[PDB]
């Protein structure tokens, strides 16, 4: 019945003491934290407490959207030889550090995901040419479907893949996705392998990457400029923002203390010193 | 009245019993006692195998030695018990398995010794590798040492042999071996074996995973990390030594998808 926005417990007035009750003494060996309040060790007055933990609920903690990737495009001289103008990015949060660290305080989670796309564009070589407002196609290709080969092949027809056609200069695009994990919760960490190497098999055949599984294979986002080729080159960037909504999390963990290095828990040499210098007897 | 104490305990599972006269109570991780899979949460459809007393009993792993230079030790579950009696067998014969555990770490000394060991049970204890050229590259063999377990280290030493990489973990102690500060490990279910106080740690761990049941041969649910918070010291001796012994008992373990026996490449 205790809601996130409820006021915390009041401080009760307490006077002097002289007894066998020993709140101050404890034993951390048990693995328990001593549940003391001021009144257990000092004399206190009565205080009607008004503060609440409303801003620290799990929901409110991850209430901010965060960048994940910067997808880009490019036009050459003419065709010359090139016609592979389209960006394909493997959907994974583990590309940045900011959102990634926040999602590591916990071992598992479940959440509906809101994605917002901010698209910006610009010119390259100084020219008197003018491009007409562009339309972009952001296509979610779930694991399995055929990935676009040419900028203008069949795959772009999208008869089953969800796609967002964004017109430049309008409010950034946004969509919601339900909890889509193949498990009861997403696993921020996976202590294991995808393949068991068998003795009667070759090492190569039984090999896999430590900590990797399809638990987190969500597919890819393929983005292209719908408009045909223009004489003047325009470069475009799509920033993706993820906001985990309706979230639940399990098993707390210590937050990452040294710089991230790859999609795993690995660390790089020379980044292992998070603490600075400070004397034991200096305030 | 009768003299019952938090310090004196007796644990009985299957045909095994452990007694202790210097305990510091015991921990039930996340307040959840191990349990069998409920119908409402079930997944695989075939009738599961529940070994009960055949597997739910205390197995004692090989004893290690604590000295002034010990950096720490680690084990994986169910990995460590992979070769333990019927538990091991039931594990290899089935595609799926789930199990809780009662981990009891033992280490006695004297009223004249000193030191403190942090015994931590970490869900999904992924450890960092040893390469600065490849990520997530530790091999299955090295990732699963079995009953002997592995050890933490005080210095990160990158593997430079790109011809034949060692492909092993290089877990740095203060980093809990996974890039997080040790001082925070206390967020995980744990106990501390402080010589002046107690001589054992008892952690009852429930089955914890993102799924109801999973492959035991591929994935380790829990990880046991033992590191010396305070170093070993005795009298005025330069090289004291005291042994540390682990005894682990699977609890409420059930298995599905029986087939022929999995014969893993362990070396």
């Amino acid at each position: 019945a205790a809601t996130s926005r409820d006021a915390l417990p009041n401080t009760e007035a307490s006077g002097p003491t002289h007894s066998k009750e020993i709140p101050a003494l404890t034993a951390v060996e048990t693995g328990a934290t001593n549940p003391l309040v001021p009144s257990d060790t000092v004399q206190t007055r009565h205080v009607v407490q008004h503060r609440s933990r409303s801003e620290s609920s799990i929901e409110s903690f991850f209430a901010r959207g965060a960048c994940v990737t910067i997808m880009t495009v490019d036009n050459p001289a003419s065709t010359t030889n090139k016609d592979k103008l389209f960006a394909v990015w493997k959907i994974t949060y583990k590309d940045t550090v900011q959102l990634r660290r926040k999602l590591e305080f916990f071992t598992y989670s479940r959440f509906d995901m809101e994605l917002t796309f901010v698209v910006t564009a610009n010119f390259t070589e100084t020219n008197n040419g003018h491009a007409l407002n562009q339309v972009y196609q952001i296509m979610y290709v779930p694991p399995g479907a055929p990935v676009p080969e040419k900028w203008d092949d069949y795959t772009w027809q999208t008869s089953s893949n969800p796609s967002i056609f964004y017109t430049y200069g309008t409010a950034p695009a946004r969509i919601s996705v339900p909890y889509v994990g193949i498990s009861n919760a997403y696993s921020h960490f996976y202590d294991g392998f995808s393949k068991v190497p068998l003795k009667d098999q070759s090492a190569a055949l039984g090999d896999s990457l430590y900590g990797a599984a399809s638990l987190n294979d969500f597919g890819i986002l393929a983005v292209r400029v719908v408009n045909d080729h223009n004489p003047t080159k325009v470069t475009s960037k799509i920033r993706v923002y993820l906001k985990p909504k309706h979230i639940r999390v399990w098993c707390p963990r210590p937050p990452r203390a040294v710089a991230y290095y790859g999609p795993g828990v690995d660390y790089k040499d020379g980044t292992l010193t998070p603490l600075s210098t400070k004397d034991l007897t200096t305030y | 009245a009768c003299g019952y104490s938090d310090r004196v305990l007796q644990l009985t599972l299957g045909n095994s019993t452990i007694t202790t006269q210097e305990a510091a109570n015991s921990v039930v991780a996340y307040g959840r006692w191990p349990e069998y899979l409920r119908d409402s949460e079930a997944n695989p459809v075939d009738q599961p195998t529940e070994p009960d007393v055949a597997a739910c009993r205390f197995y004692t792993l090989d004893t290690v030695s604590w000295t002034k230079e010990s950096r720490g030790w680690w084990w994986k579950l169910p990995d460590a018990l992979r070769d333990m009696g019927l538990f091991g067998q039931n594990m290899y014969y089935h595609y799926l398995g789930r199990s809780g555990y009662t981990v009891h770490v033992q280490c006695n000394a004297s009223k004249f010794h000193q030191g403190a060991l942090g015994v931590f049970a970490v869900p999904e204890m992924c450890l960092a590798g040893d390469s600065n050229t490849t990520t997530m590259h530790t091999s299955y063999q090295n990732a699963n040492p079995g009953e002997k377990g592995g050890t933490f280290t005080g210095t990160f030493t990158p593997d430079n042999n790109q011809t034949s990489p060692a492909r092993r973990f290089c877990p740095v102690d203060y980093l809990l071996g996974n890039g997080t500060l040790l001082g925070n490990a206390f967020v995980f279910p744990h106990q501390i074996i402080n010589l002046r106080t107690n001589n054992c740690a008892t952690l009852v761990l429930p089955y914890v995973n993102s799924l109801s049941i999973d492959s035991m041969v591929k994935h380790n649910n829990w990880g046991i990390a033992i590191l010396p918070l305070a170093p070993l010291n005795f009298a005025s001796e330069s090289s004291p030594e005291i042994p540390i012994t682990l005894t682990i008992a699977p609890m409420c373990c059930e298995f599905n998808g029986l087939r022929n026996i999995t014969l893993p490449r362990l070396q």
Partner: nanobody
Amino acid sequence: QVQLQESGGGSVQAGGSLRLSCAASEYIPSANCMRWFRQAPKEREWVASVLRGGYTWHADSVKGRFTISGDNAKTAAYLQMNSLKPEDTAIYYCAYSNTCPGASADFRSWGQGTQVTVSS
């Protein structure tokens, strides 16, 4: 700084085969899309692009003959050159990217390359 090293080049007769390799000095925690390029006169040409795994793209000249793989762990890529033609003679290069399945001669650094000479 960041270093890529090409290897495996040489001189072979037409119809032959080669395998080029490009590894990074140390691991790069950003570069996941690798590419191959070549050149002979005064103009660069894109060969093939390969992201993590296993999406692989090719060009209208090297497709079917060339194949790119690369480890999904170690930041390195490989180019298997089959049914080689005297037209393939050029200096081959390697360059890391970000999330760029597409290809364009627009890379910051440039390693050194590896010469491939195809005899008639």
